Amino acid sequence: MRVIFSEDHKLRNAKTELYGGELVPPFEAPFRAEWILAAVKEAGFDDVVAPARHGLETVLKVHDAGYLNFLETAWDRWKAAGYKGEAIATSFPVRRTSPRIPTDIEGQIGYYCNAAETAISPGTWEAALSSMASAIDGADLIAAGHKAAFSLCRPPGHHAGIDMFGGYCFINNAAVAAQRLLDKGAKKIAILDVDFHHGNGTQDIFYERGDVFFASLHGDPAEAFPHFLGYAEETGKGAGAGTTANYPMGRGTPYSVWGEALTDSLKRIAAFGAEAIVVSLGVDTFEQDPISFFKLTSPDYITMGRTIAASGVPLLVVMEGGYGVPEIGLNVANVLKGVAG
Amino acid sequence: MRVIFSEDHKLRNAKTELYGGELVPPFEAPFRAEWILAAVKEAGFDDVVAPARHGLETVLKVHDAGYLNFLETAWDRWKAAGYKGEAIATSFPVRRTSPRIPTDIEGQIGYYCNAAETAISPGTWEAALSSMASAIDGADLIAAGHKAAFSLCRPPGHHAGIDMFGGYCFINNAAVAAQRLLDKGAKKIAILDVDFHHGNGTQDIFYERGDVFFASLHGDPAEAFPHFLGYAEETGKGAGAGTTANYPMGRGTPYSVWGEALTDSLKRIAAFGAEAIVVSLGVDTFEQDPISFFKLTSPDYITMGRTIAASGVPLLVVMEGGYGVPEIGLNVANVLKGVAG
Numbered sequence: 294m295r296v297i298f299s300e301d302h303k304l305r306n307a308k309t310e311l312y313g314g315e316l317v318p319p320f321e322a323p324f325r326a327e328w329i330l331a332a333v334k335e336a337g338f339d340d341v342v343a344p345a346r347h348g349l350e351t352v353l354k355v356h357d358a359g360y361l362n363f364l365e366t367a368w369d370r371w372k373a374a375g376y377k378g379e380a381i382a383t384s385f386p387v388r389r390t391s392p393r394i395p396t397d398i399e400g401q402i403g404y405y406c407n408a409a410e411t412a413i414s415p416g417t418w419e420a421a422l423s424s425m426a427s428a429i430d431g432a433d434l435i436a437a438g439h440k441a442a443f444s445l446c447r448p449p450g451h452h453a454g455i456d457m458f459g460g461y462c463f464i465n466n467a468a469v470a471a472q473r474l475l476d477k478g479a480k481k482i483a484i485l486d487v488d489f490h491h492g493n494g495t496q497d498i499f500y501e502r503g504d505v506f507f508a509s510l511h512g513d514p515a516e517a518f519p520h521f522l523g524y525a526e527e528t529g530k531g532a533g534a535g536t537t538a539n540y541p542m543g544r545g546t547p548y549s550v551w552g553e554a555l556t557d558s559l560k561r562i563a564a565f566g567a568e569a570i571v572v573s574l575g576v577d578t579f580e581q582d583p584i585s586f587f588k589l590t591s592p593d594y595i596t597m598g599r600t601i602a603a604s605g606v607p608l609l610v611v612m613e614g615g616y617g618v619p620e621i622g623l624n625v626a627n628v629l630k631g632v633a634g
Numbered sequence: 635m636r637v638i639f640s641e642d643h644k645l646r647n648a649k650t651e652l653y654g655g656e657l658v659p660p661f662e663a664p665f666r667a668e669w670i671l672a673a674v675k676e677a678g679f680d681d682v683v684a685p686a687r688h689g690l691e692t693v694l695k696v697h698d699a700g701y702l703n704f705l706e707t708a709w710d711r712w713k714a715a716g717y718k719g720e721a722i723a724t725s726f727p728v729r730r731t732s733p734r735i736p737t738d739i740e741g742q743i744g745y746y747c748n749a750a751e752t753a754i755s756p757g758t759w760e761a762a763l764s765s766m767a768s769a770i771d772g773a774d775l776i777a778a779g780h781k782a783a784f785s786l787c788r789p790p791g792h793h794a795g796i797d798m799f800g801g802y803c804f805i806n807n808a809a810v811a812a813q814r815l816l817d818k819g820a821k822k823i824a825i826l827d828v829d830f831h832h833g834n835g836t837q838d839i840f841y842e843r844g845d846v847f848f849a850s851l852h853g854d855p856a857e858a859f860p861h862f863l864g865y866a867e868e869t870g871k872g873a874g875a876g877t878t879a880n881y882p883m884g885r886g887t888p889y890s891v892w893g894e895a896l897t898d899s900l901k902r903i904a905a906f907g908a909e910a911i912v913v914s915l916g917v918d919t920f921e922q923d924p925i926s927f928f929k930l931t932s933p934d935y936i937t938m939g940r941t942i943a944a945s946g947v948p949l950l951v952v953m954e955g956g957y958g959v960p961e962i963g964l965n966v967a968n969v970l971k972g973v974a975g
């Protein structure tokens with residue numbers, strides 16, 4: 294299978310992340326992509342290609358235009374306002390606030406943010422567009438008849454909602470890929486989010502859409518980031534009724550339990566009639582992940598890839614999270630081995 | 635007039651504030667109270683007394699119980715979770731989130747926060763209770779027949795809403811004072827917020843209540859903190875209809891303009907029939923204030939106090955903001971001179 298990857302991911306190289314009341318080097322750092330690329334090549338997936346660039350045609354169908362405009366100039370405005378650090382939101386539009394959009398940079402960065410750990414830094418927008426491009430080109434391979442492809446996206450996407458960034462995410466790459474598949478002729482597409490964290494951004498984008506089914510397996514939001522979405526009761530609204538399936542799970546969950554939710558999610562996706570599945574792949578479900586509480590082992594990723602591919606429908610694998618250790622690469626590569634085997 | 639002041643304000647001595655993407659020493663630091671106290675004594679207001687302690691009777695009528703329980707244990711829980719810095723929220727319940735309350739400390743601190751610049755530190759709860767006590771004792775003086783009193787509150791209160799802390803505020807002292815006056819027999823009370831920033835917390839607490847009228851003069855929230863409340867169109871709802879009056883004003887506003895809004899607010903308060911006015915006094919309207927854009931001069935504070943007192947109705951002055959410069963003390967003292975003159 295082809296691997297789509299842009300060297301322009303490195304334009305996002307933020308210096309700070311707000312974690313535990315401290316500003317620390319970010320977990321979502323350029324070396325993650327280096328580790329993953331090296332491991333997938335070592336596993337034999339060496340057909341690596343840069344994406345063609347893309348404009349905003351596809352992404353405007355899943356993200357708000359004001360949001361994208363804000364990201365395009367956020368860093369410049371932050372710097373012009375005289376702030377000394379990176380661009381980090383402080384005030385947020387929480388319960389019982391006005392729905393109005395501020396005009397200034399401090400107000401706007403909060404208006405457009407869901408989580409303050411994520412700083413905007415110079416090059417962030419450009420990196421996000423490159424990552425989106427990798428997702429688009431991956432989708433195009435699936436549309437053209439390939440049964441699998443891997444978009445090595447960085448920065449990741451699944452916490453970015455219609456008009457919010459956060460969780461290290463700015464453009465929802467998986468959502469853009471799903472939209473691209475619909476634009477190329479699909480009528481029904483599923484997104485299956487296996488990252489440890491709920492894909493709250495993806496859920497937001499498709500919650501009221503009946504053309505996309507969203508399934509997520511994740512740490513229970515009662516006690517895990519992103520904290521404010523991902524409960525099982527959330528099944529969709531309006532045109533999207535019945536097209537969100539959340540599988541929250543608790544501390545220590547191993548594959549023997551996690552795989553049961555996987556089986557069920559795939560049943561749901563099959564009943565929906567998805568023509569392809571965009572897999573939002575994070576490997577922060579690993580038993581050594583520094584910020585997560587699941588207990589998957591490296592061999593479990595092979596099982597996971599094989600099971601998702603036994604759907605018999607084409608897969609686009611889109612990179613999301615997985616942190617801390619170079620074994621994130623082995624784990625990603627193992628999912629691909631399961632898909633290709 | 636009597637000045638109520640607790641030395642226990644000093645138990646709030648946080649190390650950090652998130653400002654401009656950096657963790658810096660807080661603007662709202664113990665020296666503020668020292669400076670203000672010294673200046674009011676210098677102006678002849680030397681009848682200074684400590685508040686009696688108070689439990690939660692009064693405050694439970696303006697703040698949510700879950701919120702107060704959260705504040706009481708937040709520091710302990712944050713430390714027990716192993717975080718190394720002070721307690722700073724990251725995820726927030728923004729647009730289109732679940733209304734559910736998280737169980738863990740990271741989820742809860744965001745659930746109960748409106749602004750991430752404000753860290754919870756050891757002693758914060760105890761300090762907030764002492765500041766609340768100063769407000770309650772001030773209210774009791776008014777209830778007993780005094781026409782003026784000054785509660786030198788620290789930490790301040792007006793950004794704390796029903797179930798949210800932020801803007802350096804944890805317990806809404808002015809809201810507690812208003813409630814105490816109602817509990818002592820008043821039927822109608824007004825809160826007049828002259829701090830540069832909108833009292834979004836106070837507005838939240840009384841938005842649907844007809845027994846309290848809230849007026850605020852402030853920097854336009856389209857460009858100024860708190861960013862997400864304080865527009866003129868917000869006039870109240872339900873039983874509270876017509877009991878919020880917001881006067882947003884722009885960059886460079888001097889007393890000649892600000893005083894016209896003051897006059898109008900007092901007309902509204904008189905028409906409401908307030909039996910007393912709780913003045914949320916911030917002096918960050920000063921032309922030198924480091925974080926604000928109004929252009930009041932030190933003499934204007936005397937005019938302001940005199941005009942508010944010309945209402946002919948008893949006043950409780952409750953300390954809010956005012957930062958940076960040594961003149962914060964002179965400016966507060968000048969309001970008291972205007973009231974007492």
Ligand SMILES: NCCCNCCCCCS
Binds near residue numbers: 460461488518577
């Ligand atoms: N203490 C837990 C901090 C979690 N903060 C954000 C993690 C985002 C990963 C996205 S895949």
Ligand SMILES: NCCCNCCCCCS
Binds near residue numbers: 399
């Ligand atoms: N760049 C403006 C930072 C504003 N941050 C909060 C100020 C709170 C004052 C309360 S009286």
Ligand SMILES: [K+]
Binds near residue numbers: 489491509510511
């Ligand atoms: K997930």
Ligand SMILES: [K+]
Binds near residue numbers: 832850851852
């Ligand atoms: K105000």
Ligand code: NA
Binds near residue numbers: 500501533
């Ligand atoms: Na949907």
Ligand code: NA
Binds near residue numbers: 840841844848877
């Ligand atoms: Na009211």
Ligand SMILES: [Zn+2]
Binds near residue numbers: 489575
């Ligand atoms: Zn993740």
Ligand SMILES: [Zn+2]
Binds near residue numbers: 830916918955956
């Ligand atoms: Zn203020």
